[PDB]
Design an enzyme around this catalytic site. Structure first.
Site, PDB file in Angstrom:
ATOM      1  N   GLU A 133       0.765  -1.224   0.000  1.00 15.81           N
ATOM      2  CA  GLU A 133       0.000   0.000   0.000  1.00 15.81           C
ATOM      3  C   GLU A 133       0.799   1.277   0.000  1.00 15.81           C
ATOM      4  O   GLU A 133       0.674   2.105   0.881  1.00 15.81           O
ATOM      5  CB  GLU A 133      -0.963   0.002   1.177  1.00 15.81           C
ATOM      6  CG  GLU A 133      -1.711  -1.323   1.271  1.00 15.81           C
ATOM      7  CD  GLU A 133      -2.824  -1.261   2.296  1.00 15.81           C
ATOM      8  OE1 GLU A 133      -2.867  -0.332   3.155  1.00 15.81           O
ATOM      9  OE2 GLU A 133      -3.713  -2.093   2.179  1.00 15.81           O
ATOM     10  N   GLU A 157      -4.912  -8.911   0.603  1.00 16.07           N
ATOM     11  CA  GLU A 157      -5.656  -8.724   1.816  1.00 16.07           C
ATOM     12  C   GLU A 157      -7.129  -8.507   1.496  1.00 16.07           C
ATOM     13  O   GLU A 157      -7.482  -7.810   0.519  1.00 16.07           O
ATOM     14  CB  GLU A 157      -5.204  -7.477   2.626  1.00 16.07           C
ATOM     15  CG  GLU A 157      -3.738  -7.400   3.008  1.00 16.07           C
ATOM     16  CD  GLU A 157      -3.395  -6.102   3.783  1.00 16.07           C
ATOM     17  OE1 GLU A 157      -2.163  -5.823   3.974  1.00 16.07           O
ATOM     18  OE2 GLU A 157      -4.363  -5.424   4.277  1.00 16.07           O
TER      19      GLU A 157
END
Ligand SMILES: O=P(O)(O)OC[C@H]1O[C@@H](O)[C@H](O)[C@@H](O)[C@H]1O
Ligand SMILES: O=P(O)(O)OC[C@H]1O[C@@H](O)[C@H](O)[C@@H](O)[C@H]1O
Lengths: 474, 474
Positions: free
Chosen positions: A166, A374
């Site tokens: 991220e 995720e």
């Protein structure tokens, strides 16, 4: 006529080193930027930190035995750079490498595939002190030395690797919102650090091709697919601007090596565009990944926003529902409540169909395979008498996402795997310990470590069955 | 601060041969599929056809003088394949070429840049009779032979060429909806013909690179950008399906040489996918265009559509407002009324912000220059005593679109030019003469041919001024 999941689909679960490991100053570990930040007053929920976390550094054998009981095909974890280089770029701490070597052997001995995240937010404080970490081009060679160290040590045993977890979050939260280290709120600095991170991603993908020629590597992007609020043309335009500024800004670089032009022009018109050196574009275009890693939790609905409108909004870090407020970029777009979906106690949207949409957009725009690195539900859990946790809300959430994944596969998206966030409960950076994601409850809270005992939740047994039937029984 | 229109911006207007020329059997011209089709009862509004049309073939000197008066930088027109090869592939009919040569000359002599469209829906009936025209690979070599004739004859005075005009429309209306020749309703034949048209397009683009090396070429796509009706996930998904099926199905092939995977898999699931042959992919992938031509009139708003819901709907061919109904593909999406926009008397949406949206999507996905090859407003006009046509409605439509174009240019889209539809009033294929789009009124209606005299409308002078100021004044 749904396709099945592929014979070797990587059914997984995930963690991140700072959130799980503890042992923050043991066995030669240096300080990370999170060790320092989390101990500043006011930065984290009730002053929680990862000094102990859930003590995975000591308990990893137990945790891996529980993964093997579950039948996990893959376990995604990150390597703590400050365990391996205590000062970020000096001499290697062999005890740090030895921990990951023990973990990887433990996984493989149980037939679990390791998925290694190189970077999950924890740059050594020494690099921050020396030159400002991600704001300096020095980090490109430093990140590369650390990556190659791992590639050479583990490349024989690990096939799947994630570069930056991220980037969009660690960079925006660290340099625009001031909510992650180094706590900066300066848009120019943000886009400079972001550009440097792009270069570091490309550089390690190039190195990877040399040191792990039969491996697979990609970045993991925090993707919230955007929706327009309605068919008002100005709202659809807000949607094009949001998708481009929030999503294409990163994914076009990862896939194509180029920033999108309408965003670039907007930034240039404000002197916010990054400083590009000769050689930057050549590097970015010559580092194609094997897959787009995708972290998905929710969609975002947007509408028009005038030049005097909404900017920073409130984020819910307490689990009191309805406390979030709109955010946006004045002139471009603002977020709005989507009245067609439910929300969690932290005001996150629950949108399984959004995952199918996001997966289709990625396949359709980039033609890339996707590893879902995720997805999961963060919620309050109750430990009941007899060490029972009935997290039906979590099962429902996961079941519906996994069903949309199967529909995306049927649509023709190449999905390599699915890593549920998270395997055991762990420390949420800004939400503390009560915002739980695990299959396995860890007995501790924000006020006490208790005994850190592991307790299988109902979802543990749900997922064990999903995995045994390769997704045929949800 | 908007970017200005660039200095050599092509301020244009456009027509198409069948719709303007007449002289359908003069000077050696062969029968086209539209010559036949339009004469079948019930195929056209009030039995109208193009035997005479607005007699441009005889009056082109007057028309080009009106273009010079306007200040037009460019005029887009189509060549009538059947004038040039009455048989489709026999001997060239020099009188046929001579008219286009005279027209090109007249244009050049008045400073006007010609934009030539190779194919605007009028394949010679001989080819349809011989081998089913677009359903046969033989059309690839015949079309190429016709294009190469024209490249050779006119390549040194014509720089800008369009290959197929709205492939998506002549293929769909002709082979799925039965509204154009050949009047077929067969999805399987539709995709086969479509695939052949794809290959024809790529083939002549390659020929062009030999014959007109200093030239620019592209297809012109009929683009209706899709919107979801709202932020219901199922509606957004219906929007992803519609954009892929209606739009990427064509533009991806024009830009990347590949069909989108989800639409492909869905067609394959039904046996409806096209017959691919060895070499096809290599050909499609080796034929980059210089630009994407976009014909734009309206956006389309969609919503979820059950497996048993909407298929074919009513289309308004009469100008009685509110007579259109919803169309869809069962299970994928259906159209729905966008409450945030006005519509014309033919139920077309007026959505100039839609144009900037569309230009933005095309630039963002394909990074191609765009030539807007048509845009305009089809409405009833009244002739007033004094040779007054007060077409304010049209001025307002075009002003708004041109303004969104300048906004797109500023946002960073490379728009090479804008060609308004149409220079004179002309015959609308399905809607007759009363559906007018011109800057110059033509004195005829669907009942009476009258004298075909040209009258300048209010919009003519409006556009004159626009060109005078290179866009600065609207
Ligand atoms: O902990 P949260 O804020 O509920 O978010 C859940 C997850 O977010 C992802 O964005 C991060 O990679 C994870 O480390 C984890 O934090
Ligand atoms: O004539 P209509 O139906 O009002 O359509 C307006 C236009 O459609 C365009 O896409 C066609 O290329 C033109 O030939 C013209 O027909």
């Amino acid at each position: 006529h749904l396709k099945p999941f592929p014979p070797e689909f990587l059914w997984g679960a995930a963690s991140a080193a700072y959130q799980v490991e503890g042992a923050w100053n043991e066995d030669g570990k240096g300080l990370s930027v999170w060790d320092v930040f989390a101990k500043q007053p006011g930065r984290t929920f009730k002053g929680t930190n990862g000094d102990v976390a859930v003590d995975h550094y000591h308990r990893y054998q137990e945790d891996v035995a529980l993964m093997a009981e579950m039948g996990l095909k893959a376990y995604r974890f990150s390597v703590s750079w400050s365990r391996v280089f205590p000062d970020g770029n000096g001499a290697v701490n062999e005890k740090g490498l030895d921990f990951y070597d023990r973990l990887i052997e433990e996984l493989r001995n149980h037939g679990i595939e390791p998925i290694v995240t190189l970077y999950h937010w924890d740059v050594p404080q020494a690099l921050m002190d020396a030159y400002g970490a991600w704001e300096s081009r020095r980090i490109i060679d430093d990140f590369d030395r650390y990556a190659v160290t791992l590639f050479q040590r583990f490349g024989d045993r690990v096939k799947y690797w994630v570069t930056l977890n991220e980037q969009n979050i660690f960079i925006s939260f660290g340099y625009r919102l001031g909510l992650h280290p180094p706590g900066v709120k300066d848009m120019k600095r943000m886009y400079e650090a972001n550009h440097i991170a792009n270069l570091a991603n490309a550089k390690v993908i190039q190195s990877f091709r040399h040191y792990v020629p039969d491996g697979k590597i990609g970045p993991s992007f925090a993707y919230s697919p955007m929706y327009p609020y309605d068919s008002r043309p100005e709202n659809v335009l807000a949607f094009e601007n949001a998708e481009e500024f929030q999503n294409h800004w990163w994914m076009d670089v990862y896939a194509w090596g180029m920033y999108p032009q309408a965003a670039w022009n907007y930034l240039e018109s404000q002197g916010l565009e990054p400083t590009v050196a000769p050689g930057d574009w050549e590097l970015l275009q010559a580092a194609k990944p094997d897959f787009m890693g995708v972290n998905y939790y929710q969609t975002t609905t947007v509408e028009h926003n005038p030049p005097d409108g909404v900017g920073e909004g409130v984020m819910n870090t307490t689990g009191k529902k309805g406390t979030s407020t709109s955010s946006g970029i004045p002139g471009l777009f603002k977020t709005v409540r989507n009245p067609h979906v439910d929300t969690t106690n932290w005001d996150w949207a629950i949108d399984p169909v959004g995952l199918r949409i996001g997966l289709r957009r990625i396949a359709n725009r980039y033609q890339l395979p996707i590893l879902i690195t995720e997805n999961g539900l963060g919620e309050f859990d109750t430990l009941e008498p007899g060490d029972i946790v009935n997290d039906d809300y979590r099962i429902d959430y996961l079941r519906r996402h996994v069903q949309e994944i199967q529909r995306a596969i049927t649509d023709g998206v190449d999905v390599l795997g699915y890593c549920a966030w998270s395997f055991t409960d762990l420390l949420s950076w800004l939400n503390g310990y009560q915002k739980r994601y695990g299959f396995v409850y860890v007995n501790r809270d924000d006020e006490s470590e208790k005994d850190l005992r592991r307790i299988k939740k109902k979802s543990f047994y749900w997922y064990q069955r999903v995995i045994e039937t390769n997704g045929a029984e949800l």
